Amino acid sequence: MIVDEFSSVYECLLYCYKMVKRSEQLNGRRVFPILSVVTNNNDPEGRRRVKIADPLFGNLIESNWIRPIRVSQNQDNPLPQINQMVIVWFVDGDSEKGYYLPIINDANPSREKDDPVNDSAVRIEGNNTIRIDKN
Amino acid sequence: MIVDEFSSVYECLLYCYKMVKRSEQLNGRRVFPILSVVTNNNDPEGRRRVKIADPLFGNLIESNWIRPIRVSQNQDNPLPQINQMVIVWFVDGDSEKGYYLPIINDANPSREKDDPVNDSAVRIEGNNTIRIDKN
């Protein structure tokens, strides 16, 4: 609605009373992605989920299990270690539906490269298992 | 507060007053992820950060350094090249806390595959280094 300069007090109130629905829906939600520290990565269900210490709760209360994100379907990449930082999104803004992805910090520093742009440096602290059905 | 059809001007005003706070917090923030063109990838700090030309500033002003996201902890994948497009999220909606991931575009085209769904095609323009501590 084009609530221009020549607008009555009632027109302005009506405009506010109609466009505030999105704000009401956002209440009690989680709008932006967050940065968190991984505190638990032993998932009893084997679903590669981790627990975080998000700054909202100030490490007082433990959070809910946070599910991983992968680039392709059939890769199970190494999980973040304890005290490593991840970025967490909340599906539909629900604090109980969080999905994470590791970031580059110092507990997770950058690997040495000759050319940081084109070269690829990868380290695995466990076994590496690659199985290819085709050529 | 169920603000039904039978409501006074004061009840509606109170509903607006109690509800616009999330929208006030949203002011001067970045709500959605953005698409941007990478203009600088030489990070003097060695933190694999890149500079972008986001459409908000119309390539008039340079942006802040934007940090990468990885799927694994000890993976240091090749960085986006100059003039390539990435998707950027802003933690807590802050413009100065940005985290990026490259996407498939034209400066970033799709690799040739026999099966586009199941096949994996990877090219590295620099050195490739893999270290496995276990088997």
């Binding site: 009555s8 009632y10 009506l14 | 006074s8 001007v9 004061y10 509606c12």
Partner: peptide
């Protein structure tokens, strides 16, 4: 005084109902 305060409040309420049903 309070009679008119109430009258004015009711006027405002009905004026707002006018506006609610004035706009598409």
């Amino acid at each position: 005084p309070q009679a008119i305060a109430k009258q004015i409040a009711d006027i405002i309420n009905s004026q707002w109902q006018g506006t609610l049903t004035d706009y598409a």
